[PDB]
Amino acid sequence: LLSDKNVAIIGGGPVGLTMAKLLQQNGIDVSVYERDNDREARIFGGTLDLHKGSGQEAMKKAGLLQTYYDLALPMGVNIADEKGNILSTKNVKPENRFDNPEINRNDLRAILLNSLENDTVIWDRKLVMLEPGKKKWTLTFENKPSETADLVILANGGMSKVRKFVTDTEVEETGTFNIQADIHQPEINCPGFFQLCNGNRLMASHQGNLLFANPNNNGALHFGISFKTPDEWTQVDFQNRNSVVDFLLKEFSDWDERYKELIHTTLSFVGLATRIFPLEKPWKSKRPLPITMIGDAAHLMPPFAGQGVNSGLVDALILSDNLADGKFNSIEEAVKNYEQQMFIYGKEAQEESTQNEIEMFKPDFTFQ
Numbered sequence: 169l170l171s172d173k174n175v176a177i178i179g180g181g182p183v184g185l186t187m188a189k190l191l192q193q194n195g196i197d198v199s200v201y202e203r204d205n206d207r208e209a210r211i212f213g214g215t216l217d218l219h220k221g222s223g224q225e226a227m228k229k230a231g232l233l234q235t236y237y238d239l240a241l242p243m244g245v246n247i248a249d250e251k252g253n254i255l256s257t258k259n260v261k262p263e264n265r266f267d268n269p270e271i272n273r274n275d276l277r278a279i280l281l282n283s284l285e286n287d288t289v290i291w292d293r294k295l296v297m298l299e300p301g302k303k304k305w306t307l308t309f310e311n312k313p314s315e316t317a318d319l320v321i322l323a324n325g326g327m328s329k330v331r332k333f334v335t336d337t338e339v340e341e342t343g344t345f346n347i348q349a350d351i352h353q354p355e356i357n358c359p360g361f362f363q364l365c366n367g368n369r370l371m372a373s374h375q376g377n378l379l380f381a382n383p384n385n386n387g388a389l390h391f392g393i394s395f396k397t398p399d400e401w402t403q404v405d406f407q408n409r410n411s412v413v414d415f416l417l418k419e420f421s422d423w424d425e426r427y428k429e430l431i432h433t434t435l436s437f438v439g440l441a442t443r444i445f446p447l448e449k450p451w452k453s454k455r456p457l458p459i460t461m462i463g464d465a466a467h468l469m470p471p472f473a474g475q476g477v478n479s480g481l482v483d484a485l486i487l488s489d490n491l492a493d494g495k496f497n498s499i500e501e502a503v504k505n506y507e508q509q510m511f512i513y514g515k516e517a518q519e520e521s522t523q524n525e526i527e528m529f530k531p532d533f534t535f536q
């Protein structure tokens with residue numbers, strides 16, 4: 169159905185690599201073009217958890233579920249207030265494979281990459297421009313040779329700049345903001361807080377500020393602080409750690425010293441306004457050649473419903489299935505169908521994540 173043709177996946181995240189695998193195992197010629205310099209580029213962020221009905225199904229179809237279980241770490245959850253512990257949900261042994269197990273992002277990438285043929289991914293390729301030829305797409309990469317493909321799948325994340333041939337829809341800010349950081353040797357560097365986590369994830373919310381932590385992301389503590397974006401904003405510089413610290417100390421002044429210590433020992437902070445790429449409007453029905461989008465390029469949504477990668481890996485599964493069978497008359501029909509399905513579950517997820525985002529920042533929120 170792609171019989172004499174080649175496919176170009178833009179972006180080698182979890183969604184794009186998985187796409188690559190499901191396509192490659194059906195004999196389809198595919199390349200992944202990835203901005204990052206090489207296999208070993210550190211991916212910043214906390215862990216991902218694949219769910220039994222969605223994410224795990226993609227891995228299962230990929231022959232990678234067991235490997236995901238082997239590397240993934242199930243975790244409990246503690247809910248704390250701006251000092252003490254309010255609930256402790258440890259994982260029960262029949263729930264430990266179950267829509268739980270936390271995996272590190274480099275670990276996940278290493279599983280996917282290893283499952284692929286050699287030289288499927290081409291590194292150090294930043295797609296800047298896309299241009300429709302007669303029977304093929306011409307792809308322009310910063311300071312590197314251009315390439316052509318019959319079908320482009322955009323898997324290049326929520327801030328993809330190369331979406332115009334699918335949709336004119338734009339990324340939007342939702343009104344909240346996130347500060348993320350890693351602490352190494354958390355047991356040395358934030359002892360008291362590491363001891364509150366006690367090997368579990370931790371969440372606390374108080375007076376509009378939400379704190380989330382995972383104490384064991386391959387031995388690093390990853391934490392996030394989220395809040396309604398200030399009307400003043402931006403007016404904090406994420407390059408000057410001092411300006412961030414000062415801001416967080418004002419905001420967190422009521423909180424226990426163990427949380428303050430977290431802000432104190434962090435070397436480097438990443439500030440990111442929550443964004444949504446809303447599935448508000450249908451995508452373009454007239455397109456010059458075959459192109460589509462999966463993952464966060466398709467449906468970037470706030471990270472508070474835990475959804476995100478899961479619906480992206482479902483996109484992978486539905487799309488590859490659709491491309492394989494030759495049930496459809498044309499690539500263009502296969503894409504249309506995938507997109508129809510994705511609009512439905514994607515909108516579901518976006519509503520869930522939006523409503524949770526609203527719920528959580530509602531002034532008097534508590535996690536139970």
Ligand SMILES: Cc1cc2nc3c(=O)[nH]c(=O)nc-3n(C[C@H](O)[C@H](O)[C@H](O)COP(=O)(O)OP(=O)(O)OC[C@H]3O[C@@H](n4cnc5c(N)ncnc54)[C@H](O)[C@@H]3O)c2cc1C
Pocket residue numbers: 178179180181182183184201202203204213214215216217293294295296323324325326328346348440462463464465471474475476477478480
């Ligand atoms: C702070 C934060 C916390 C999150 N927490 C969770 C969570 O707990 N659970 C969850 O399910 N989701 C979470 N998400 C969402 C989740 O991380 C993403 O949904 C997932 O990584 C999306 O996969 P993706 O591969 O589609 O996008 P990405 O993961 O963003 O992959 C995009 C890839 O494309 C590359 N790329 C970008 N531009 C180009 C280009 N021009 N050319 C070539 N390559 C390019 C990038 O290098 C990257 O490799 C979170 C997101 C954020 C920001």
Ligand SMILES: CN(C)[C@@H]1C(O)=C(C(N)=O)C(=O)[C@@]2(O)C(O)=C3C(=O)c4c(O)ccc(I)c4C[C@H]3C[C@@H]12
Pocket residue numbers: 214215346348369380381382390391392393394471472473474475524528
């Ligand atoms: C991205 N950032 C806002 C948060 C974060 O920093 C962490 C983390 N552990 O560092 C996370 O754990 C996070 O990625 C994350 O995983 C979250 C969830 O899984 C989640 C959920 O599944 C259902 C309801 C709620 I409500 C949440 C909270 C979300 C918090 C997310």
